[PDB]
Design a binder for this molecule. Structure first.
Ligand SMILES: [Cl-]
Ligand code: NI
Length: 328
């Protein structure tokens, strides 16, 4: 009785149902053996409760570009086997708790390029298996305590190009296994110490394009034994505090380009450092920069930049200049 829907293209004996831009106004009825349902580029302004009934074997659901504005509570009830959910490129503003009920198995959730403004408590509570939460290009302004409550195994959190200006203490307490954290291109006017101080296994921290101005003491200590990649490019960075890199023991990749740095802290970790972007900084070629000098001459392929001061060595390259001869 159940066959491929009208104007749709089915594959793998009705296991894959593709309805790409076919003028749908309602969720079509599909066979119970459906495992992949692509409803991209249709029109579903409101996803009501039980919008996907009788799809117990569905593992991948694609709903991008569907002009979706609201996801009602229990919109995805029954999808106990769903692994992928794409809600990217819609007009979602309202996203309340219950919207993600029954999504016990969901591992990848894409909500990027929407109009979400907040992440209320309990919204992600059912998502105990979520690994990637892609929320880039929204309008979230603030993360508060319990914003990620229930997200037990969240590893990658994408929040690039939002309007974040505040991370409350306790905001990330629920995401202990967090490895990737992208909050570049936001409104962070200071390093969110309190929020990050609770995480221990962060490996990549992307903070580019935030007016951070400076990095405080113990900025990375909590997760200092796991931090491998750090982006601080275009953060209007004037300097690092003396204790900023306390407990950092395996940092491999750093991006500092496009800032106002003249110096580096004495405890700057060069021991595990592999790549370091440092162009477009008014570097001061004095004694305190010898550590960077010693690192650059340890492997020739490592790019460098030019000193803005002192006057004698203005414009010379860090690796070529004679500004470090009078210190040993
Ligand atoms: Cl086919
Ligand atoms: Ni096919």
């Amino acid at each position: 009785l159940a066959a491929c829907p009208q104007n749709c293209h089915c594959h793998s004996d009705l296991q894959h149902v593709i309805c790409d831009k076919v003028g749908l106004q309602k969720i079509p009825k599909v066979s119970e053996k459906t495992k992949l349902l692509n409803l991209q580029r249709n029109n579903f302004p409101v996803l009501a409760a039980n919008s996907f009934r009788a799809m117990p074997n569905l593992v991948s659901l694609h709903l991008q570009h569907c002009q979706i504005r609201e996801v009602a509570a229990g919109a995805f009830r029954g999808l106990k086997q769903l692994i992928y959910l794409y809600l990217s490129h819609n007009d979602i503003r309202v996203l309340r708790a219950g919207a993600f009920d029954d999504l016990t198995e969901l591992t990848y959730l894409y909500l990027d390029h929407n109009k979400v403004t907040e992440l209320p408590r309990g919204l992600l509570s059912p998502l105990v298996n979520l690994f990637i939460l892609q929320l880039n290009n929204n309008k979230i302004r603030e993360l508060r305590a319990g914003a990620f409550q229930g997200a037990k195994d969240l590893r990658w959190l994408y929040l690039s190009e939002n309007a974040l200006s505040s991370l409350q203490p306790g905001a990330l307490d629920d995401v202990e296994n967090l490895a990737k954290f992208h909050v570049d291109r936001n409104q962070l006017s200071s390093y969110p110490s309190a929020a990050l101080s609770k995480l221990r296994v962060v490996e990549e921290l992307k903070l580019s394009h935030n007016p951070l101005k400076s990095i405080p003491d113990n900025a990375f200590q909590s997760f200092g034994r796991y931090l491998e990649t750090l982006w601080l490019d275009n953060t209007n960075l004037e300097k690092f505090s003396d204790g900023a890199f306390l407990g950092v023991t395996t940092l491999k990749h750093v991006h500092l380009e496009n800032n106002r740095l003249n110096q580096l802290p004495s405890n700057f970790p060069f021991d595990s450092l592999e790549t370091l972007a440092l162009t477009n900084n008014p570097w001061k070629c004095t004694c305190q920069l010898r550590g960077l000098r010693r690192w650059l001459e340890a492997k020739a392929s490592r790019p460098d930049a030019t000193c803005a001061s002192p006057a004698k060595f203005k414009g010379q390259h860090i690796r070529d200049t004679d500004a470090f001869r009078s210190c040993k």
